[PDB]
DNA sequence: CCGCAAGGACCGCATACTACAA
């Protein structure tokens, strides 16, 4: 339960750094990502993980595939920040830090939203807790870097 | 302890509490100077929660992002908004300065060493 | 036989991690009933070994 | 005519009797909203619109009389309600004023309904009424209008940056003023002293800010709901059918009681009252204002 | 454990009340507060206390508080804080602290939080009578066995401080609700068979007389009795879920006078004529003037200040929502 | 290891919305109408009731609101985009209340296969209340996927 | 074989308001969670939380001479009867809140000043969940429990049996999609129950459990249930206790601007009302003594009379109406 | 009859954050 925290922190630092790198001169994008990262756990708490992912989906389709998302191809800061947070959260649940690391995800590459629709209630609960935990780490680095 | 550090020239500070605990911190001599002139010292002696959180969780911090996690804990524990921004920048700089003079293999052990030092000198039972 | 179905053997490092970071860490306080708030120096943390722990001692 | 009611088994036969005037019903919104008739107009085509429902009655006049006969049976209870409402007004030292519908009034025309049209009727008493949200809204949008027609050139010049965000006539000015009041209210220092007359009273932009409030500070004026006096519920029809598709309206000549109250030391209820009075005359409230609906005298 | 006196605050809604619980990703964007396992509408104690405290604060700063003479807090603070009185007044004026009596009754503001606890306990506002549209009788005041049972338990708590079975198709109702010679009542979309009883409604009205007297928020209590109905718990649950007020609101774009993009949402309200009640428990202050230096004195200040008062609870204040009539039954 | 109804709701909603997008990929009108009607449906239910909502849809198809089994309704047999969409929405909603997400799923419906509208006009108020809440819940998820997938 | 104690009393606790027995702030979406047993996830109230509540109440009652022993208990007189010479100085300590009244210190132990003198006579056990309220499609809500909870209740009875030396005082298997439930919860013609967001198949135990509840808390249940009792599997029950608690957003409003202040928005967890918990209260020989309370049986009697049918407040947020419970203390 | 079909602020702040004997 300690090594998993380090893995989360490593991922969180990486994705926030990518945000700050690509949009260094764009404070609006950085600020939007930060706000959404803070609001995200709340949306999950009050609506569940499934609905939250669906809510992100509406901010972007043919199929539910986080891989196919391209955050940089959007017009405004709101959609760019949403697409990034959505992909980050989905990537973590599906891939972790890669298959060369301790944590390689929970869903084995499957999109978390479709995963929720197919697997058991237990599978959904662990995905919910894990989602809250990674967002909690993203919030830390967001406040300190963005 | 002190003479076993590469390059030596080290102060080894130990606190043996009456209850039984034994805290040890290895520091370079310049740490003493930096700390006494620091805003961090005046703020700590103006606490245990800041020190606890860092010591309890430093092993979960990412190797590549230690500095950023330090920024966070300063934001969370150090606070008008004008003075708040200034104090956070200053204290973070002091912590980074102090870390330069802590004896340790890596940044993590340096953080542990520093906040172990802070835990010793803020012990209300030892410094009433 | 009921216990057999719920035994989990994990690696040495993982077991050590759980025994060190999954024990109960509880905040306790002392209330100054005069004010109805937490008294000065009335906050501390205490560790507990959980219930449902099995231990053994050899009595020689 | 064949009528069907898609409700639970025992309610369906009672709803049948209610609409056929075989049994008395005392609540208007109940029979309208929860006992909707589906009328077999022709073939196998059922309809639930007011146009189809009207066929249950001898004529449009018969339909109207039924609705108002049901409505009026809440008079005794409504009187106590209205009296407590007045007590509420005076407890907040409200500026109370009464105005009369100059033309037909229809608030809440677009509330989702199987009738395809609707109107805000009180849940318990059935009377039509005007929500404080609408009253506050129409007063604020009227304030936007006067500031645009009188000070449009200057406001568009001072806030050229905000103008670019919106975008160059009156309708662009009104939107710019709104964005200033709604989103960029920290920048209203430049035209804070700008004043407007409506009609013999002087209202500044800074006063308008405090009256309606912003995201950083609650409004200093309470805009209460507006209700028709009990005497009219007793004396005259509070509802009548109109045509666009039939839809319910409040007839011309219906007196409503309005009230605004100060909740700050600034005491801006008087300015808000004068601003609201003018809004109800020039803009009107509710749906279809571009056809003259919702005007007050 | 210092609670010696308890007073019941009756809250009768004059306008629709929105005690919010945050936005949700559903048709009802802004729902009202509900108890989770029952689904019953509530106003949490913290929501009610904030309103009571705010009102009491504004009245104390305007010297409108009576203790049967006027209350001067600045003068009573000088008698209490002495040398540090001028410092405390500057804190209140700088909104860093609250006036003396407000901090005594409701507890100190942030800066003085650890000094002492609040003297009173503001209970959750519970539903007692829910207004339901009725085929006969215009609308009924409806309650249920669970509500009555909770009302009974709350009395066992009050008295300690001071030292019906229905099936889903049955109702106990007053005569003004019953259809002419059918022994049936129609409430919303539900047809209920009248169950013969001669105690439940009577005792319920007696309870309301003990608390609020003959004056039932602007009307004689006898008028209400004929329109009181008790229904099953399942039926009451359905009423409080599907007979709340669901209001469509919009924000108009001043450009064309049309609804802005994402400018349409729905808000939930408790309807007018909803009767809720809260247990206000009063204990010995822990901070103090001799005028308000015990339980009985605080109770007297609470009653007179809030009895027959009109209070706004919850959100949408400036568009005229949340206004209730308060009765303080001791 | 069981599943929660929410999982079945999301699953069913995705399936029926994908079914429309598949059968009418070139028809943006049908997709746009369905999304509009899915958005409108919960509000009609709250104001007028579930029974009146189901009947409202059938009346759009000019079907006798008293003599129609949901299974007999085939959305692919209508001309205009409106009636196609109404038929789909009525079908999806009725199927959910009648069969859920399948007989071996974690939710197999509430009406035990009986036509929901016929069920409503035959059962008690409490039965209708339970179905009404469930209708709102499945429509919430239909709206979610319609908003993200269906185009205008 | 539990000879360190001689008698035991079960403290039944029924919440009539939501309860926040706190564990402190966390860096999490739920800023202020309630107390939980970590390895089961079950909500608890730690014995030290309950002891502090019981002690404070007992102390106030003794200071106001409302304590009944066998007539009224005059602690100052009994203090003079026991301490004799140095009794006056002890009473002065009590009035200065340095020490606590005689019976209070006998039962619960000395105030912190006299900690080293002797230990307390009673052991206040952690409160554990017995019935947890869960919303139901039919019957409004259910009192939910599980085999592992029923088992822990039986084991606690074995503790009472060993302590009181009463051998006379001393099987539920369910699938995850199955339940044993009362008639009020069962959907019309389906043989199924819907609790929260889970469909459960009705299985053909409750009557026996009620008889057990009738033993501890008397013929009446806290002045009030079998029709809404639902027995579910251990893991389903666990998920309910962890995800069906009240989670509430609270704010602090700027008194001048009417808007949320900085550092004025947090989420707080509450154990729901209609939750049944219980704590085992073990009583040993007093370690400090007047004849009225010189042994275990007399101390038990005082505890029973003092707290049975009483109302207590446990946890924080008392001022916003949280933590109110009704107590039943049976042997 | 047709159309729509939320957004940002706040984002746990402060206090208590061992005491004492044996």
Domain count, chain D: 1
What's the CATH superfamily of F1-152?
AF1862-like domain (1.10.520.30)
Among D35, D124, D135, beta carbon nearest to E271: D124
For B61, nearest residue in chain A (alpha carbons): A6
The number of beta carbons lying within 10 Å of the beta carbon of residue G170 is: 12
Residue A82 CB lies within 7 Å of the nucleic strand H: no
Residue D217 touches partner G, C-beta closer than 8 Å: yes
Q: Which 8-state DSSP code applies to residue G130?
A: E
The number of beta carbons lying within 10 Å of the beta carbon of residue F151 is: 12
The contacts of residue E330 (CB under 8 Å, 6+ apart) are E5, E7, E299, E303
Residue G257 CB lies within 7 Å of the nucleic strand H: no
**Whole-angstrom distance, CA of residue E192 vs CA of residue E195:** 9
**Whole-angstrom distance, CA of residue E21 vs CA of residue E269:** 12
**Whole-angstrom distance, CA of residue D236 vs CA of residue A45:** 52
Among E27, E169, E189, beta carbon nearest to F46: E27
Would the CA dihedral through D119, D125, D130, D133 be positive or negative? negative
CA angle A132, E18, F141 (to 5 degrees): 45
Residue E213 CB lies within 7 Å of the nucleic strand H: no
Please tell me which residue lies nearest to nucleotide H19, judged from CA to C1': C41
**Whole-angstrom distance, CA of residue E134 vs CA of residue D31:** 10
Residue G177 touches partner F, C-beta closer than 8 Å: yes
Residue E257 CB lies within 7 Å of the nucleic strand H: no
Contact F48, D36 (CB under 8 A): yes
Beta bridge partners of E276: E11, E127
For residue F124, which residues of chain D lie inside 8 Å, CB to CB?
Answer: 8-9
Residue F29 CB lies within 7 Å of the nucleic strand H: no
Please tell me which residue lies nearest to nucleotide H8, judged from CA to C1': D215
Residue D145 CB lies within 7 Å of the nucleic strand H: no
Please tell me which residue lies nearest to nucleotide H9, judged from CA to C1': D215
Return chain B residues 84..123 having CB < 7 Å to nucleic acid strand H: none
Pairing mode, if any, of strands E228-231 and E275-282? unpaired
Identify the CATH number of the domain in which residue B81 sits.
1.20.120.1260
**Using N-to-C axis directions, what is the helix angle for F5-23 and F125-149, rounded to 10°?**
50
Contact E265, E29 (CB under 8 A): yes
Q: How far is E142 from chain G (nearest CA, A)?
A: 16
**Whole-angstrom distance, CA of residue E123 vs CA of residue G322:** 7
Inter-CA distances, D291 with A86, B16, D103, D264, E301, Å: 47, 88, 10, 38, 55
| SS3 (DSSP) at D127 | coil
**Whole-angstrom distance, CA of residue D108 vs CA of residue D128:** 10
Contact D284, D145 (CB under 8 A): no
The contacts of residue D61 (CB under 8 Å, 6+ apart) are none
Burial (CB < 10 A; 0-12, 13-18, 19+), residue G81, is middle
Q: E274 — phi, psi (to 5°)?
A: -95, 125
Domain residues for D22? 1-297
Domain residues for B71? 29-128
* Preferred mutation among A56, A121, A124, A128 to probe F, highest tally of F CBs within 10 A: A121
**Whole-angstrom distance, CA of residue G256 vs CA of residue G236:** 47
**Whole-angstrom distance, CA of residue E246 vs CA of residue E267:** 6
CA D273 to centroid of chain Cα atoms: 16
Among E25, E238, E266, beta carbon nearest to F126: E238
D12/H13 CA-to-C1' distance in Å:
57
The contacts of residue G273 (CB under 8 Å, 6+ apart) are E35, G15, G16, G17, G18, G19, G133
For E119, nearest residue in chain C (alpha carbons): C36
Strand boundaries in chain G, DSSP class E: 7-15, 44-45, 122-124, 127-135, 141-145, 178-181, 192-195, 198-202, 229-232, 246-253, 260-270, 276-283, 311-313, 324-330
The contacts of residue C13 (CB under 8 Å, 6+ apart) are none
Contact E295, E162 (CB under 8 A): no
Contact E328, E311 (CB under 8 A): no
CA D134 to centroid of chain Cα atoms: 6
Contact E19, E127 (CB under 8 A): no
Q: Which 8-state DSSP code applies to residue E112?
A: G
**Length of chain C in residues, anyone?**
60
The number of beta carbons lying within 10 Å of the beta carbon of residue D214 is: 18
Q: E222 — phi, psi (to 5°)?
A: -70, -30
**Whole-angstrom distance, CA of residue D82 vs CA of residue D69:** 20
**Whole-angstrom distance, CA of residue G12 vs CA of residue G114:** 31
- State which H helix or E strand residue E228 sits in: strand E228-231
What's the CATH superfamily of A1-146?
AF1862-like domain (1.10.520.30)
Secondary structure in 3-state letters for chain B? CHHHCCCCCEEEEEEECCCCCEEEEEEECHHHHHHHCCHHHHHHCCCHHHHHHHHHHHHHCCHHHHHHHHHHHHHHHCCCHHHHHHHHHHHHHHHHHHHCCECCCCHHHHHHHHHHHHHHHCCCCCCC
Residue B81 CB lies within 7 Å of the nucleic strand H: no
**Whole-angstrom distance, CA of residue G54 vs CA of residue G108:** 9
**Length of chain E in residues, anyone?**
330
The number of beta carbons lying within 10 Å of the beta carbon of residue A83 is: 21
Contact E161, E5 (CB under 8 A): yes
Give percent helix, percent strand, percent coil of chain F, each to the nearest 5.
Answer: 70, 0, 30
**Whole-angstrom distance, CA of residue G183 vs CA of residue G196:** 17
Residue F14 touches partner A, C-beta closer than 8 Å: yes
| SS3 (DSSP) at E10 | strand
For E144, nearest residue in chain G (alpha carbons): G140
The number of beta carbons lying within 10 Å of the beta carbon of residue G58 is: 22
Contact F82, F60 (CB under 8 A): yes
Q: How far is B103 from chain A (nearest CA, A)?
A: 23
**Whole-angstrom distance, CA of residue G117 vs CA of residue G102:** 13
The number of beta carbons lying within 10 Å of the beta carbon of residue E171 is: 27
Burial (CB < 10 A; 0-12, 13-18, 19+), residue G28, is middle
Chains C and E touch, contact meaning at least 3 pairs of CB atoms under 8 angstroms apart: yes
The verdict on a CB contact (< 8 Å) between G112 and C30 is yes
**Whole-angstrom distance, CA of residue G111 vs CA of residue F138:** 59
**Length of chain F in residues, anyone?**
152
Q: Enter the resolution in angstroms.
A: 2.1
Reference G194, options F12, F116, F102, F109; nearest CA is F109
Please tell me which residue lies nearest to nucleotide H21, judged from CA to C1': G116
The contacts of residue D17 (CB under 8 Å, 6+ apart) are D23
Contact G6, G316 (CB under 8 A): no
Residue D33 touches partner F, C-beta closer than 8 Å: yes
Residue F71 touches partner A, C-beta closer than 8 Å: no
B18/H18 CA-to-C1' distance in Å:
14
Reference B106, options B62, B73, B72, B68; nearest CA is B62
Pairing mode, if any, of strands G141-145 and G127-135? antiparallel
**Length of chain G in residues, anyone?**
331
| SS3 (DSSP) at F108 | coil
As given in the structure block, the two tokens for residue D98 are 């009464």
Among F46, F125, F139, beta carbon nearest to E189: F125
As given in the structure block, the two tokens for residue D211 are 């009256």
Q: Which nucleotides of H are covered by protein (CB under 7 A)?
A: 1-22
**Whole-angstrom distance, CA of residue D242 vs CA of residue A32:** 49
For residue E39, which residues of chain G lie inside 8 Å, CB to CB?
Answer: 135, 140
Query: Which nt is closest to the CA of G113, judged by C1'?
Result: H20
**Whole-angstrom distance, CA of residue F127 vs CA of residue F112:** 12
**Length of chain D in residues, anyone?**
297
Reference G27, options A2, A146, B77, A126; nearest CA is B77
Burial (CB < 10 A; 0-12, 13-18, 19+), residue G10, is buried
**Whole-angstrom distance, CA of residue D49 vs CA of residue D115:** 4
Burial (CB < 10 A; 0-12, 13-18, 19+), residue G238, is middle
For G235, nearest residue in chain A (alpha carbons): A122
By what technique were these coordinates determined? X-ray
| SS3 (DSSP) at F30 | helix
The verdict on a CB contact (< 8 Å) between G38 and C30 is no
**Whole-angstrom distance, CA of residue G214 vs CA of residue G210:** 6
The verdict on a CB contact (< 8 Å) between C36 and E116 is yes
Residue G309 touches partner F, C-beta closer than 8 Å: no
DSSP G162-202: HHTT-TTT------TTEEEE-GGGS-TTTSEEEETTEEEEE
**Whole-angstrom distance, CA of residue D59 vs CA of residue D55:** 7
The contacts of residue D147 (CB under 8 Å, 6+ apart) are D155, D177, D194, D196, D205, D208
| SS3 (DSSP) at E84 | helix
B49/H20 CA-to-C1' distance in Å:
23
């Amino acid at each position: 339960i300690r090594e998993i925290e380090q893995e989360r922190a490593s991922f969180a630092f990486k994705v926030v750094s990518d945000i700050k790198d690509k949009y260094s001169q764009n404070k609006k994008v950085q600020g939007k990502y930060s706000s959404y990262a803070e609001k995200a756990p709340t949306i999950i708490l009050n609506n569940g993980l499934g609905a939250t992912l669906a809510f992100f989906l509406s901010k972007l389709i043919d199929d539910v595939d986080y891989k196919s998302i391209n955050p940089e191809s959007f017009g405004n800061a709101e959609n760019i920040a949403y697409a990034f947070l959505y992909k980050h959260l989905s990537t973590w649940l599906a891939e972790g830090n890669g298959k060369d690391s301790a944590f390689s995800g929970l869903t084995n590459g499957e999109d978390p939203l479709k995963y929720i629709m197919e697997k058991t209630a237990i599978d959904v609960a662990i995905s919910t807790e894990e989602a809250l935990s990674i967002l909690n780490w993203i919030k830390k680095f967001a406040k300190a870097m963005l | 302890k002190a003479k076993n550090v590469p390059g030596k020239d080290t102060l080894a500070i130990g606190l043996l509490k009456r209850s039984g605990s034994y805290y040890i911190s290895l520091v370079g001599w310049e740490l003493i100077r930096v700390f006494y002139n620091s805003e961090l010292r005046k703020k700590l002696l103006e606490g245990k929660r800041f020190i606890y959180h860092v010591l309890r969780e430093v092993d979960t911090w990412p190797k590549v992002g230690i500095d950023e996690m330090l920024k966070f804990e300063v934001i969370r524990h150090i606070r008008n908004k004008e003075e708040t921004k200034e104090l956070r920048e200053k204290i973070y700089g002091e912590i980074k300065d102090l870390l330069e003079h802590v004896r340790g293999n890596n940044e993590v052990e340096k953080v542990r060493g520093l906040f172990t030092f802070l835990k010793i000198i803020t012990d209300a039972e030892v410094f009433p | 036989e009921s216990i057999k179905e719920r035994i989990a053997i994990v690696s040495d490092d993982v077991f050590k991690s759980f025994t060190r970071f999954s024990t109960e860490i509880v905040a306790r306080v002392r209330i100054d009933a005069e004010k109805g708030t937490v008294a000065r120096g009335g906050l501390w943390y205490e560790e507990f070994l959980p219930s449902d722990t099995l231990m053994y001692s050899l009595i020689a | 005519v064949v009528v069907k009611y898609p409700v639970n088994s025992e309610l369906a036969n009672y709803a049948e009797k209610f609409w056929k005037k075989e049994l008395a019903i005392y609540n208007l919104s109940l029979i309208l909203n929860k006992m909707t008739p589906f009328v077999k107009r022709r073939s196998e085509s059922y309809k639930s619109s007011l146009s189809a429902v009207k066929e249950i009655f001898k004529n449009v006049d018969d339909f109207q009389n039924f609705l108002n006969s049901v409505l009026r049976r809440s008079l005794d209870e409504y009187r106590v309600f209205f009296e407590n409402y007045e007590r509420l007004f005076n407890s907040f030292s409200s500026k109370i004023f009464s105005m009369r519908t100059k033309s037909r009034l229809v608030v809440g025309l677009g509330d989702e309904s199987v009738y395809e049209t609707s109107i805000r009727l009180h849940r318990n008493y059935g009377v039509p009424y005007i929500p404080g949200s609408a009253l506050k809204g129409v007063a604020k949008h009227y304030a936007f209008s006067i500031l645009a027609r009188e000070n449009g050139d200057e406001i568009l010049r001072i806030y050229e940056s905000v103008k670019e965000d919106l975008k160059e006539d009156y309708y662009l000015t009104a939107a710019v003023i709104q964005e200033l009041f709604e989103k960029k209210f920290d920048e209203l220092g430049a035209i804070r002293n700008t004043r407007v007359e409506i009609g013999d009273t002087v209202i500044s932009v800074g006063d308008i800010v405090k009256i309606f409030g912003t995201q950083k500070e609650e409004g200093s004026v309470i805009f209460f709901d507006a209700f028709p006096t009990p005497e009219q519920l007793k004396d005259k029809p509070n509802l009548e059918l109109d045509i666009m598709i039939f839809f319910l309206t409040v007839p011309a000549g219906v007196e409503f009681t309005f009230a605004v109250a100060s909740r700050d030391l600034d005491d801006l209820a008087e300015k808000a009252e004068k601003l609201l009075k003018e809004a109800l005359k020039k803009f009107g409230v509710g749906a279809k204002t571009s056809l003259g609906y919702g005007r007050f005298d | 454990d210092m609670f010696e006196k308890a007073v019941v605050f009756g809250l009768y809604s004059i306008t629709p009340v929105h005690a919010g619980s945050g936005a949700e990703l559903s048709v009802i964007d802004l729902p009202i507060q509900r108890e989770r396992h029952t689904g019953f509408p509530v106003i949490w104690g913290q929501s009610l206390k904030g309103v009571l405290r705010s009102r009491f604060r504004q009245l104390e700063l305007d010297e409108k508080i009576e203790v049967s003479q006027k209350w001067k807090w600045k003068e009573k603070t000088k008698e209490v804080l002495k040398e540090k009185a001028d410092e405390f007044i500057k804190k209140v004026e700088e909104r860093k602290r609250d006036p003396l009596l407000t901090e005594i009754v409701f507890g100190p503001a942030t800066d003085g939080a650890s000094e002492h606890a609040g003297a009173v306990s503001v209970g959750d506002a519970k539903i007692l009578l829910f207004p339901v549209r009725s085929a006969k009788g215009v609308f009924a005041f409806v309650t249920s066995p669970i509500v009555i049972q909770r009302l009974k338990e709350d009395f066992e708590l009050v008295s300690e401080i001071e030292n019906v079975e229905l099936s889903n198709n049955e109702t106990i109702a007053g005569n003004a609700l019953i259809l002419n010679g059918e022994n049936k009542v129609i409430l919303e979309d539900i047809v209920l068979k009248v169950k013969s009883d001669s105690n439940v409604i009577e005792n319920l009205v007696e309870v309301l007389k003990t608390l609020f007297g003959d004056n039932f928020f602007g009307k004689p209590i006898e008028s209400i009795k004929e329109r009181i109905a008790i229904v099953s718990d399942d039926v009451f649950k359905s009423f409080t879920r599907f007979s709340t007020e669901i209001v469509a609101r919009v924000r108009i774009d001043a450009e064309k006078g049309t609804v802005a993009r994402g400018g349409l949402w729905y808000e939930e309200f408790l309807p007018s004529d909803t009767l809720m009640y809260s247990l206000i428990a009063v204990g010995s202050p822990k901070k103090l003037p001799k005028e308000v230096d015990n339980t009985q004195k605080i109770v007297n200040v609470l009653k007179v200040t809030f009895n027959n008062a009109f209070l706004q609870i919850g959100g949408d204040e400036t568009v005229g929502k949340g206004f209730v009539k308060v009765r303080a039954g001791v």
